[PDB]
Amino acid sequence: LADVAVLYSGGKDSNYALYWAIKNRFSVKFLVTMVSENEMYHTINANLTDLQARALGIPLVKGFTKEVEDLKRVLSGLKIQGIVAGALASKYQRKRIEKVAKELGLEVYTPARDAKEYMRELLNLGFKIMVVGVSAYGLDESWLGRILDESALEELITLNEKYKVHVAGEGGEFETFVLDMPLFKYKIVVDKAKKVTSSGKLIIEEAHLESKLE
Amino acid sequence: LADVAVLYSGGKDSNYALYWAIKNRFSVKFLVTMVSENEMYHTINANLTDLQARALGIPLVKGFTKEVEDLKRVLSGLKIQGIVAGALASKYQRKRIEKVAKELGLEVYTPARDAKEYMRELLNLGFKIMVVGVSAYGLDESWLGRILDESALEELITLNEKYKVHVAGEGGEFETFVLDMPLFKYKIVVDKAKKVTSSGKLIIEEAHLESKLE
Ligand SMILES: Nc1ncnc2c1ncn2[C@@H]1O[C@H](COP(=O)(O)O)[C@@H](O)[C@H]1O
Numbered sequence: 001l002a003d004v005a006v007l008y009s010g011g012k013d014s015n016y017a018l019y020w021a022i023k024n025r026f027s028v029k030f031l032v033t034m035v036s037e038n039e040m041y042h043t044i045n046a047n048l049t050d051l052q053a054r055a056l057g058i059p060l061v062k063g064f065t066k067e068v069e070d071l072k073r074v075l076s077g078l079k080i081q082g083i084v085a086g087a088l089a090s091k092y093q094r095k096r097i098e099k100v101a102k103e104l105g106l107e108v109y110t111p112a113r114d115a116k117e118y119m120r121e122l123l124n125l126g127f128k129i130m131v132v133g134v135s136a137y138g139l140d141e142s143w144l145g146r147i148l149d150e151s152a153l154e155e156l157i158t159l160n161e162k163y164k165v166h167v168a169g170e171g172g173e174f175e176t177f178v179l180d181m182p183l184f185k186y187k188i189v190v191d192k193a194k195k196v197t198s199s200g201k202l203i204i205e206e207a208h209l210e211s212k213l214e
Numbered sequence: 215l216a217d218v219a220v221l222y223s224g225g226k227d228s229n230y231a232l233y234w235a236i237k238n239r240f241s242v243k244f245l246v247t248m249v250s251e252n253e254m255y256h257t258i259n260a261n262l263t264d265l266q267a268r269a270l271g272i273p274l275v276k277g278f279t280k281e282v283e284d285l286k287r288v289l290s291g292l293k294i295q296g297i298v299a300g301a302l303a304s305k306y307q308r309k310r311i312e313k314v315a316k317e318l319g320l321e322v323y324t325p326a327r328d329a330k331e332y333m334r335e336l337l338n339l340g341f342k343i344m345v346v347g348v349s350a351y352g353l354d355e356s357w358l359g360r361i362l363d364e365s366a367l368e369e370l371i372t373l374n375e376k377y378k379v380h381v382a383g384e385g386g387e388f389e390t391f392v393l394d395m396p397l398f399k400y401k402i403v404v405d406k407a408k409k410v411t412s413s414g415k416l417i418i419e420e421a422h423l424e425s426k427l428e
């Protein structure tokens with residue numbers, strides 16, 4: 001029952017879900033990423049979680065796509081007992097997870113919910129988070145490619161207590177990409193990104209792994 | 215017993231093994247690629263089989279690494295009955311496959327061996343094969359990035375009946391990458407490659423998928 005697969009899309013919560021699972025003695029046999037044609041090229045920006053999976057040394061399973069049926073199809077081919085998803089999964093995402101899980105007879109392990117507290121915990125845990133998506137007023141394109149720290153957290157809280165932008169970007173406020181965390185054996189360094197409704201998006205063009213102190 | 219995983223590294227034989235398996239009514243649940251640090255960047259040249267897996271629509275499992283222990287670890291997490299490998303696997307490769315297979319209690323399905331005949335069959339089946347590796351005298355860097363056809367086959371046979379270079383590159387003579395085959399839903403187009411003992415190597419920098427007639 002310790003054998004599980006983590007739904008990994010690359011952002012702060014997928015990574016927190018991974019850290020949580022490992023710390024709670026779970027046996028993460030696989031990371032699972034679903035790729036939809038809804039978003040074809042050679043750029044690394046297509047295999048970002050693939051870059052993180054190498055930093056982690058953990059096997060990565062990639063599915064392709066009614067995404068519920070495709071997900072269940074992928075997960076059904078794995079020798080696992082449960083599915084690990086972050087406690088910040090979309091209100092809709094949780095429904096799909098619950099549905100496929102039940103139908104497959106799998107457990108839905110999830111971290112047992114204050115935005116501020118959560119965000120602070122990630123920083124204290126050594127999470128290196130970069131903003132790669134933005135879709136909320138009060139967040140100019142300047143936020144793209146920017147890393148979050150005790151400083152950026154303030155600006156988020158200050159922005160929240162004004163434009164009411166979620167502190168944990170819960171709801172599409174902004175997308176993230178984790179460049180480093182305690183479990184990474186290698187750090188991810190962005191060499192070239194270049195930025196593109198107040199909808200922003202950072203397309204990573206050049207990136208590489210760098211060994212950590214260890 | 216129909217459920218299997220194909221050891222897919224991207225070349226002509228991995229793809230032939232895949233085609234053979236699908237045609238023989240096997241249920242290919244996953245493609246498995248092992249990535250070793252023995253060969254760190256963002257280039258697509260790292261996720262080439264990932265590009266093919268999208269063209270195929272088949273889930274891809276990627277392992278990281280005694281590669282035998284790592285392979286068995288990956289395959290042990292999949293709900294399969296056997297392993298599919300091409301009949302051209304290295305004389306050593308077959309030993310590892312047999313070892314892990316036996317230890318996991320899995321079947322080792324493999325295509326039931328004339329080089330010329332084999333190479334001709336691939337062309338007749340519509341295989342679009344590009345040379346991305348070279349390590350044999352009589353094969354100048356001009357062969358890198360070159361596509362194989364009834365014409366290139368002759369030059370290979372003519373070269374064989376002289377420098378004794380294997381027709382199926384069996385033994386490290388040359389590495390390949392399949393840009394298209396009947397099972398691909400999309401074709402792979404190389405936009406920018408640039409070439410690098412008579413050891414040659416083609417590093418693909420730009421590539422993309424293009425829809426097929428269907
Ligand atoms: N294939 C998937 N299906 C459903 N939910 C997913 C999938 N992949 C990732 N997630 C959820 O996405 C959340 C993380 O989003 P993020 O912080 O941007 O990486 C996690 O809490 C997961 O539960």
Ligand SMILES: Nc1ncnc2c1ncn2[C@@H]1O[C@H](COP(=O)(O)O)[C@@H](O)[C@H]1O
Pocket residue numbers: 221222223224225226227228229231246247248285298299300301302303304307310311389390
């Ligand atoms: N992870 C692996 N372990 C052992 N053999 C492999 C692995 N991946 C691919 N192969 C073998 O590599 C052969 C294909 O080489 P190629 O034609 O260059 O793609 C196949 O016949 C497979 O049996």
